[PDB]
Amino acid sequence: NPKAFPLADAALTQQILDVVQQAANLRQLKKGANEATKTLNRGISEFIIMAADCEPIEILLHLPLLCEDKNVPYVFVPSRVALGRACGVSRPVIAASITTNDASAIKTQIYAVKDKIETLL
Amino acid sequence: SKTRYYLEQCIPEMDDLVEKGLFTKNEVSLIMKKRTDFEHRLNSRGSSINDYIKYINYESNVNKLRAKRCKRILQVKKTNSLSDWSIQQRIGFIYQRGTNKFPQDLKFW
Amino acid sequence: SADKVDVMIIQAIALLDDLDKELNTYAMRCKEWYGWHFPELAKIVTDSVAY
Amino acid sequence: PIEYLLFEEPTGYAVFKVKLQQDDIGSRLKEVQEQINDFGAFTKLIELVSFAPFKGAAEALENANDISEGLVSESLKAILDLNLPKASSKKKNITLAISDKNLGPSIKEEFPYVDCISNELAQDLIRGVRLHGEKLFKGLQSGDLERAQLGLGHAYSRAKVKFSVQKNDNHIIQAIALLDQLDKDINTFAMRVKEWYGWHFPELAKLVPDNYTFAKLVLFIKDKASLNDDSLHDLAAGIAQRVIDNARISMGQDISETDMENVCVFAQRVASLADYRRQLYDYLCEKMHTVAPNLSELIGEVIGARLISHAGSLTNLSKQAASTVQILGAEKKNKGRISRYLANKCSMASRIDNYSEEPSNVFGSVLKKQVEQRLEFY
Amino acid sequence: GARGGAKVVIEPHRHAGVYIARGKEDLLVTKNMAPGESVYGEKRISVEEPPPTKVEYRVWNPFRSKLAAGIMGGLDELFIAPGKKVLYLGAASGTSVSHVSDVVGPEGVVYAVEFSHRPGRELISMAKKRPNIIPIIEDARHPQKYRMLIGMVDCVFADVAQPDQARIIALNSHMFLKDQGGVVISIKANCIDSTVDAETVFAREVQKLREERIKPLEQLTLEPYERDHCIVVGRYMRSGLK
Amino acid sequence: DDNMRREVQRDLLLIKHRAALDPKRHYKKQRWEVPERFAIGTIIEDKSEFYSSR
C-alpha cells in the first residue's frame, strides 16, 4: 500500500500523455504543481496527472486531498521526464492539469481518458 | 378494564373462605375493597414497586391471619380446600407481574 | 501621612480588572489546549479553577 | 417464524423474544406499517429478554469492528449461547432475525441449531426497535445512547483511517498563540510592578529597565533598608553602587508595608510567568523540530509557528497553493524576488513535512542550500 | 464588495437556522457552532451581544457547497431544521458538513459518512472541533456495516458521485430514515450518465425514487451556481403513498 | 432596543433604499419590511486573504 496508489501501466500512460500533448498544442493545459492546485481550487480541471518519481513525493502528493474532495480524477505516471516531453517544455513538469473547455476539439479523447481512469480507480 | 378481571378472578377463594366459617361477610368485604384499591393502584398508569411491595405485605399478612383463624376456629391446620394455596398463588402472580413490569430493581428481584 | 493613600487603591482595582480578563483568556486557552486531548469535560465543568 | 431478534447497540447487545407475529402478506399496508411507528403497539409485538452491555470502551470498539466486517465475537457468541434454546431436531431449529446477510453465515457456521433470517420483516422489525430505542429497554442500563455512539463513531473512524496521532499541529498553533499573548501579559503586569513599586523606589525604573531582572530584584529588596550588601546585586542583576546610594539619596518615598508585601507576591509570580515563557518557547522550538522539521530548518522555528498559525492548520497550509503563502511580516526587485523564492520553497517544505508520515531534515537542509545559493546570486 | 470590515445586518430567513446577511450586497450566513476558527477558509461575520459576549457567523459560499445553491435559488421547505438529526451521504470534507452542522445546532446531530481516506482524515480533524457530528469513514453502498453506531435519523442528504445514486439512498433510507422523513438528494447529470442529457437523467432518477417509495415533492436545478446538478427533495412515505 | 439608537435607524433606511446607492448595481425588487429581530455585524476577513477584500 504505497503513497502513489493509482499508478497507471504502460498503454494507459501513452494515451493519457498523447492527450496531454494534444491539449498543450490546443492551449488547454496547465503545467506545474502550484498552477495545477490553483486551477484545481478554482474548479476548472477535467483531470490532473502527477509524476510518481519526483525526489520528494509529497510536493505533488498534496494534490489528492484537493482533487478527490472536489471530485475530479487524478492519475500517477511513472516518469516526470516523460511527462515533460509530453507537455512539450524543456524542464520536467511533474504535475499537469487539463482545464475544462467545451470549445476544444479533444473533448472525445479527454472523456475516453477520464472514463478509463475512473474505471482504473 | 383488566383490574375488574383480576378482582373477579380472586372471588372463589373468598367464596369458600366464607363458606367455611372462618371469615364473615363484613370483614371479607372489607378485605375485598382494600384489595380493590390496592389492585387499581397496582394497575394504574405509572405505578411503583413500593405499591407492589406493600400489596405483597397485605397478602402475606392476610395469609397469616387466615392460618391463625384456621388454627383457632376450626382447630385444623390444612383445610384441604381452595382456601389454602390461593394466597400463595396470588403472591406468585404479583411477583411475576412485578418482575415483568419493573425489571431493574434487584431488591424486588 | 501616606498610609491612608488612594492612588494605590485605584490601580489595585485596575490590576484586578486586567487580571480578571487575563485569567478568563487563559482559561479559554487552557480549556481548548487540554480539550484537544479531552473535549468531553469543558462542557461538564465550568469553574475554571476547578478545571 | 421470526421468534428471536438480535439488535446491536453502542452500549450493548440486545436479544428480543418476538411474542406474537407480524402480518407477512399485508406487510406493505398503511395500517400495518404505522404500527411500527407508534409505541403502544410495538411493545405488543417485541419484548426485551436479554441485554448484555459490553462495558470496556476498547471492547466496544472491537465488537463494532467485528460486526462491521461481519464476524462473530466473544460477547455476541456468549449471549447467543446463553439465550438461544437448543431446538431439538424433532420440532425444528430456532430462528433469529438478524440485520444483515453478511453476518448470517458467520453465526450459521458457529451455531448449527440457529437459523438466521433477514427479509424485509426482520428489516422493519429492527427498524422499529431502532426507532423506539431507549423506551424498549425499560431501565436495564446506565447511560444514554447518543454520547456513547458519538465516542464509538469517532473511535471507529480513527481505527479505519489509522490516523497518525503524533502529527500534531494543533499543539504548535496553541503554543504560539499562547506565547505571543503571554509575552504581552508579562509586559503589562511588569509595567504594573514598575508603576506599583515606583511609590516605594522611583529611581529604579531608570537604573533597571529589564522587566524580569527588575521583578527579581524587587523580590530581593523589600524596603529601602539594604544599604550595605553590595556583593548580592551583581548576582541579582557597578550599577550596584548606584542603586545602593540611590536607596538613601532618593527618598521619593511612601513608607507603606502591606502593599509592599503584595508587590513582592506579584513580582515573584510575574517572575514565575517569565520562567514559564522561557521554557515554553524552548518547548515549541523542539516540538517544531519534531512535527515540522523541513519548514523549521528552512524558515526558523518561531517564524514557522507563526506561519502555521496564520494558515490555521498544517494540512490547510499544505493544501494552499504556493503563491498564496503571502504572509506579512514573516519571510523578511532584489528585495522581492528572494521573498517569492522563499515563499514557494516554504510551501514545498510544508508539503513534504505534512504529507509525510513522519518527516526528516535532509530536504529542509537542501532547501536551505538552494535558497542560500539564490541569495548569494546577489 | 463585501470586504473585511463592513457592517452587515443579520436578518433571519424562512429556513430556521440560516440567516440572510444584508449589507450593500447580500450574503447567506449560518450561525457558527465553534467560534474563532474558519474550517475551509470562508469569511465570518462577528456580532457582539450583552458580561460582554461575542458570537460569530460563517458565510456560505454557494459555488463550493451544494445545498447552499438550492437555498439561494429558493426551496419550499428543507428538512434541516434546528433540532433534527441529519444523515450526510457523501460528506466530502468540512466544506459543507460544517454548514449543515451549525444549521442543525447543539442538540441535533449530523452523521457524515465518507468512503475515501484522505478526506476522511480531514473530516475527523474537523470533527474533533464541533461535537454535534459523527464522522464515519465507510462506504455509503453498505449501510449494514455502520448500522452499529447510528440510529433513526430524521433527514438524509446525498452528494455521492456514483451511478447507483438511487440504490444508495434507497438502502440507506430503508435502513435508517424514519417514516415521514425527508430526503434531499443532489444528482449530477454528467456524473451519473454522460450519454443522454440533463432532464432525461433527472426524470429517470426521480422515477427510481418514486419506485423506491420516496414520494418526491421538489425539483430545483441550481443553474447560476453549478451546472446541470439538481436538488430533489422528497418524503419517505412507506404508508399511504397516494 | 425601542429607542433604536438612530444609527440602525440610518443604515436600515440605507439598505432599504439600497437600490439607488450606486448606478451600476440594480438590485432586484423586494419590499423589505424591517425585521423586528436583527443584529449588526462586522466581516472578519480571512487571514489567508489580503490586498483584495481587506
Swiss-Prot record, chain A:
Signal peptide (from-to): none
GO MF annotations, alphabetized: RNA binding; U3 snoRNA binding; U4 snRNA binding
Subcellular location(s) per record: Nucleus, Nucleolus
A biological process from GO: box C/D sno(s)RNA 3'-end processing
CDD domains found in the cross-reference section: SNU13
Cellular compartments per GO CC: box C/D methylation guide snoRNP complex; nucleolus; nucleoplasm; nucleus; precatalytic spliceosome; small-subunit processome; spliceosomal complex; U4 snRNP
Pfam family, one: Ribosomal_L7Ae
Keyword terms: mRNA processing, mRNA splicing, Nucleus, Ribonucleoprotein, Ribosome biogenesis, RNA-binding, rRNA processing, Spliceosome
InterPro entries named among the record's database cross-references: eL8/uL1-like, H/ACA_rnp_Nhp2-like, Ribosomal_eL30-like_sf, Ribosomal_eL8-like_CS, Ribosomal_eL8/eL30/eS12/Gad45, Ribosomal_eL8/Nhp2
Mutagenesis or variant effect for residue 80 to A: Impairs binding to U4 snRNA, but not U3 snoRNA, and causes pre rRNA processing defects and an accumulation of unspliced U3 snoRNA
SUPFAM superfamilies in UniProt: L30e-like
Documented effect of changing residue 55 to A: Impairs binding to U4 snRNA, but not U3 snoRNA. Causes pre-mRNA splicing and pre-rRNA processing defects
Keyword Zinc belongs to the record: no
Protein family according to the UniProt entry: Belongs to the eukaryotic ribosomal protein eL8 family.
Function: Common component of the spliceosome and rRNA processing machinery. In association with the spliceosomal U4/U6.U5 tri-snRNP particle, required for splicing of pre-mRNA. In association with box C/D snoRNPs, required for processing of pre-ribosomal RNA (rRNA) and site-specific 2'-O-methylation of substrate RNAs. Essential for the accumulation and stability of U4 snRNA, U6 snRNA, and box C/D snoRNAs.
Gene: SNU13
Swiss-Prot record, chain C:
Location relative to the cell: Nucleus, Nucleolus
Family the entry assigns: Belongs to the NOP5/NOP56 family.
Further remark: Present with 34700 molecules/cell in log phase SD medium.
Subunit organization: Interacts with SIK1/NOP56 and NOP1. Interacts with the trimethylguanosine synthase TGS1. Component of the ribosomal small subunit (SSU) processome composed of at least 40 protein subunits and snoRNA U3.
Function noted in UniProt: Required for pre-18S rRNA processing. May bind microtubules.
UniProt protein name: Nucleolar protein 58
Organism: Saccharomyces cerevisiae (strain ATCC 204508 / S288c)
Gene behind the chain: NOP58
Part of the whole protein covered: 155 to 205 of 511
Swiss-Prot record, chain D:
PTM annotation (Phosphoserine): residues: 313
Compartments in which it is found: Nucleus, Nucleolus
Domain Nop: 291-378
The keyword Nucleus appears for this protein: yes
Main location: nucleus
Gene Ontology cellular component list: 90S preribosome; box C/D methylation guide snoRNP complex; nucleolus; nucleoplasm; nucleus; small-subunit processome
Subunit structure comment from the entry: Interacts with NOP1 and NOP58. Component of the ribosomal small subunit (SSU) processome composed of at least 40 protein subunits and snoRNA U3.
Family in the record: Belongs to the NOP5/NOP56 family.
Protein name: Nucleolar protein 56
Organism: Saccharomyces cerevisiae (strain ATCC 204508 / S288c) (Baker's yeast)
First and last residues shown, out of full length: 3 to 415 of 504
From Swiss-Prot, chain F:
Subcellular location(s) of the protein: Nucleus, Nucleolus
Protein origin, superkingdom: Eukaryota
Description of how the protein assembles with itself and partners: Interacts with FAF1.
Similarity comment: Belongs to the FCF2 family.
Role this protein plays: Essential protein involved in pre-rRNA processing and 40S ribosomal subunit assembly. Required for the early cleavage steps of 35S rRNA at the A(0), A(1), and A(2) sites.
Entry protein name: rRNA-processing protein FCF2
Organism of derivation: Saccharomyces cerevisiae (strain ATCC 204508 / S288c)
Residues shown, of full length: 110 to 163 of 217
